[PDB]
Symmetry: C6
Subunit: 276 residues, 6 copies
């Protein structure tokens, strides 16, 4: 039920997208020691650096006392020899060692002040709380296994990850128009564009070889989510306006797709089919 010409070729490829958030981060600090006060739940919206947080801060407060006293000393000291030499009382060598003990005891102050700034947790981006692995009583411990402790990420702006593959990868470039949809609200179709390839076999990012090729786009509302899978198709050609042979020239010039080719050379219209 077909004949000649037009210009509606759409070549497409299709793979299936695992969808994602644009960023996304796990958080637990260089400290050890059990925790005390936990500030969030499930899926809170959180703006920058917040309160999460807090391992018991106890011995770090200790070490603050100890380096702030031994700083009050050296401070008074070289503040006093800051007024000798300025007469010419004692030396220019007794100044070097009063400054040394000062600077050294200020350093060692900003140090254990840091290890207190550790004990306080902070969210590394304004975002939303995915996970909360970790609990008010929880005797965490670092050393060599960072813990994480809160997971959080950004869900306006999401980005989908089309497990595309080894064959069709000489094509799929950037900026190709794509459409895709879910599995959750079939009457929709989302369009976007394709935004970047990888150049990385998605084993190699984070038998059976895929090459992601991310597409981003803003989720307003909270509609989408994150684990989700999508079905997606990606125009790898578009000639508006040449010549179309509903398929079979089988038992010249391309390309064929899907089974519905495409006349370039020469020719022109008017013509035939195959039947049968």
């Amino acid at each position: 039920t077909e004949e000649v010409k037009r210009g509606n070729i759409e070549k497409n490829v299709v793979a299936t997208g695992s969808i994602e958030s644009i960023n996304t981060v796990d958080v637990g600090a260089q400290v050890s020691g059990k925790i005390t006060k936990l500030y969030v739940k499930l899926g809170q919206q959180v703006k920058k650096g917040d309160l999460l947080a807090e391992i018991d801060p106890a011995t770090y407060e200790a070490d603050y006392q100890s380096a702030q006293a031994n700083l009050a000393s050296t401070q008074e000291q070289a503040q006093r020899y800051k007024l000798l030499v300025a007469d010419q009382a004692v030396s220019k060598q007794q100044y070097a060692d009063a400054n040394a003990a000062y600077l050294q005891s200020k350093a060692a102050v900003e140090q254990a002040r840091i290890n207190l700034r550790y004990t306080k947790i902070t969210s590394p981006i304004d975002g939303t709380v995915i996970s909360t692995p970790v609990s008010e009583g929880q005797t965490v411990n670092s050393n060599q296994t960072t813990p994480t402790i809160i997971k959080v990420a950004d869900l306006s702006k999401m980005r989908i990850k089309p497990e595309i593959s080894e064959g069709d990868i000489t094509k799929v470039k950037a900026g190709q128009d794509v459409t895709f949809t879910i599995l959750s609200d079939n009457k929709t179709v989302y369009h976007a564009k394709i935004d970047s390839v990888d150049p990385a076999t998605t084993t190699i990012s984070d038998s059976a070889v895929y090459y992601y090729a991310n597409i981003i786009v803003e989720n307003p509302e909270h509609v989408l989510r994150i684990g989700m899978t999508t079905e997606n198709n990606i125009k790898i050609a578009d000639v508006q306006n040449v010549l179309f042979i509903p398929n079979l020239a089988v038992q010249e010039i391309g390309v064929q797709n899907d089974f519905q080719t495409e006349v370039k050379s020469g020719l022109t219209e008017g013509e035939k089919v195959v039947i049968s």
Copy 2:
């Protein structure tokens, strides 16, 4: 095979809930060294901070002696120079170092006093004892793998985790009325509401699912915790529009006729949009 005056549907979805306790925590300390005295058996009711607990406290008592002597010294010292300068005997610089040794030896006292407060265990909430992995003779050790040592949690108030999924997730919101029940006492049905979604694929909390927790108070023992439940969740309720027992079945198209508009159904007992008035030519079979 007519109307329903105007009528009343329940769309529901259903998934299967792994049930849970509201909170729940594992406990074992920053210390190492073997233990000595263990205070609970599973399924003890425990109120706050209690006695669990206790790794052998031996070398931590040592370090208490050693920092409390070296504190008795500096305390006497700068308590003595606290009465010089207040004459004007010795200086204002020999005070700085008597205070330094004091503060420093008080600090290092609160430190090893802390590492004794570690050795003593405490329960991070008033609750009940799930597990007791760990035993009177047991030569535990921290460093880099925290142990836990007691698990304990709260079982009045429980919360169930309906492994719901990728399809139906555009719906299920919060505050939806839900009912569910177990596998253990079939003549029951518990109602509750739905209390929160996640926004998190339940791999990503802790084949694609998205939990959506529902809480509610367990009085008595009754429920438990490992349990699974079967649960169904009203994703619509129109009290009072028009009901076509299903088929006008398809660019959807709808036999007797006219055509209609549509939606929605469930379990296969579709709903009208115009339609259609009352009585009409009812379409079957």
Copy 3:
């Protein structure tokens, strides 16, 4: 071949018990360093704290010399200034520092004396030796992986663990009479009582959901053992003395069991069946 009344209902449930010892502990110390002398085998009866034991004690003896000399010093010292001031010879500040070096050198003595008490092993209960993972030549090492080194536990008093399940758990309470038996001596049947539930899905203690419910009881002789599995049944009801309808009232009032119900309301006797 049946009619009315009585009072022999036994509802029962049944699951299969993995049997156990009441306690049970693994043992290897905070030390490192290879071992030397090992005192037990296979399944010895052992009473408290014994000799197991002993990593090579060598450098810990070293550190005993070193802190016991530096203690002989301070001891002589402040024993000598314990007799000044008691005249009024030297000061009250030279006493503080002689006591300090004393206390400090006694502390540091009880410390490396402890690290020698480590090197000696001890059994944390009068019991019996399950396992002996670990051998006269064996270059063990702690740090962050405790070793264990002997396993030992108590086998008078055993306790069985009936993998019971998600359905029948609204019933099975405590104090229910139970019977169970093995797989090794079929002409027996052991009775006991049920002694505690858990409230813990036996994944959660130490697809497919079970809830243990321990039952203890004394193994005299050594007959039972430990790995064993048992088959067990647990009276979750007993009405002595109401009304019994050999089953089928199918195509009122309960409960039914197994297929052999149970008349409450109203009624009385004399009556029928089903046939057919």
Copy 4:
């Protein structure tokens, strides 16, 4: 089809024995650092403590120099004040500190001398070399994973481990006569006795089994170690009662007749209790 005067049964059980060496040990030291000289190849006969061995000893020789100088000092010192006071020159308090520095610097000498004695390897028993996991160039390292480095064990005297099981375990005791054989030399049969049970499910030492070891001297090479054996174990022996080739087969009940009493059999050649006298009407088929 009569009696057996009085007769002689063997009940047996049978399981399959994984065979073993009596002892057996893995060896690699508290040290780190690469190695240098390796003294054995597998299947060397070795007698006690030998030369294995040797991680590069380099920095441990360093720490020997450094603690042996600082010992030469304190030795000369308090050897000198060992001749004051014995006049009455200098004090009784300057002796305390010369002794302290002495003892302390002898201690710290026996310490780094020890960490040299580590660097040298030694075989924890006179025996034979199973394995040699570890090589002349091999940059080993301890800390928290002890290495092993040579495995060695004793192969005169071996001991076989009959994966026996949950049923038959109420029987099999110690001192039962056993026979077993391999898979490698079928015309043999080795007898021994059974020497110990366990009381330990062979998951729990190191589908339910309970080992029950049997030892015996391997002279020559002959046996080996990975081997499996097939073994059978007399759990009864009545020399001299009455034997009914099996069936009176069932509340057990026993055809010709009369009835009997019973037990026991094996492999299906049952035994009488009364019974039954001599000759009788033999029941078959």
Copy 5:
């Protein structure tokens, strides 16, 4: 069915190539502590040493203050005693210790300056960014598990890894002409040469295979890296001897006749040794 004058064969073998980049490296430093500023996204072209990078540098700046003061001191000091002795004021032994404190405090300055140079990341080659495992908030930590943190490598010049195997390995040497192609652009065929064997079972680099790498310049993006290729490798080429389309098929024996001598074939189009002259009685079918 005759001769080939003298004729021209291609034996080939074939295996399937996993393709690769020439180099390729993972990068994350000796430091610990969380990060702060991250400079790249995957698939950035990067030239040498760049900005990646940066764990929070905080306490390393601290230790810079502390060792640069204690250096200002000793510098002034021995700069002052650099002008004694050059009179002859104080000694030649008070110089030794002023130099010692100097050198020692310069050393400990280059040390903590180093641990700041750590905190800054750098790309170990001019190349392109594969991976970016690691994120602006990410609380990394070293010690004993190096992290990596960026992966990057070189994609002009790629090299393909033909999982070739245990049989054909006595052949395939180096410098053999090869052709191969993908799975993604079938109208192509890439030729190259073979550039090296391994001598290493490709389990042992990083069912038995032996890689045998072939390199060649990827200009443009075109290829990629995960890819598989299908590749065939001329293990013989006699231009110009005699060709018997196969069968004289067997102590091998060769119908029409006479007999021949033989080899070799492929895919089943065998070759003569005498044979046989021209024309002859061609054997079929």
Copy 6:
């Protein structure tokens, strides 16, 4: 088609050999810290100790400065008191402490000189490079997981590992003549002898029980390789010259092999068969 006598029995056993190199070693040092310069590729021939190597040597050069200055000091010092006492100027106790600081500062010199000798890598045998796991940029790190970093071994002299088994192990001794071949060049057959058993179930070296029994032999050229598998057969008997009954004496005296026995007692020749 057979009769009596001779002396061509060959009993043989057969198993399949995984072949190997005689030695073989993995190499990466006690250091940490990233690397810098890497000297080899794929399969280089390398003679002893070479250049491989080199983690960035930076802070180890630091610690060389620091202990070589503090050595220049003590060296000058006790070189100066080496000329007192030799008059009789200052004491015999001030010498002890000048020597102490000297020896101690020489020790501490050979120490950080060692930690520089670490940073330089060296091949633990003249051989060939199997593997090169590890790369110019590679931020390696030891502590508790040695890295390895180059793998290298010897491929003249190879040694094959005949997964032989639990049955036939009462036989296979040493010095038995063996032949074997590959899978890669069928027209060959290599002979060798058998050179050692193990006494070790090849799980136990480095359901289903094998016992290796190595055979070595020189690979000249580079022909063999290493991953390879071989098929091998091993004469466990050879009587040249007794009496041979093509098999079946079935429905005396052995042994039988394969199905082609072997007359000892008594007898003599001339005789029969089985047919049928």
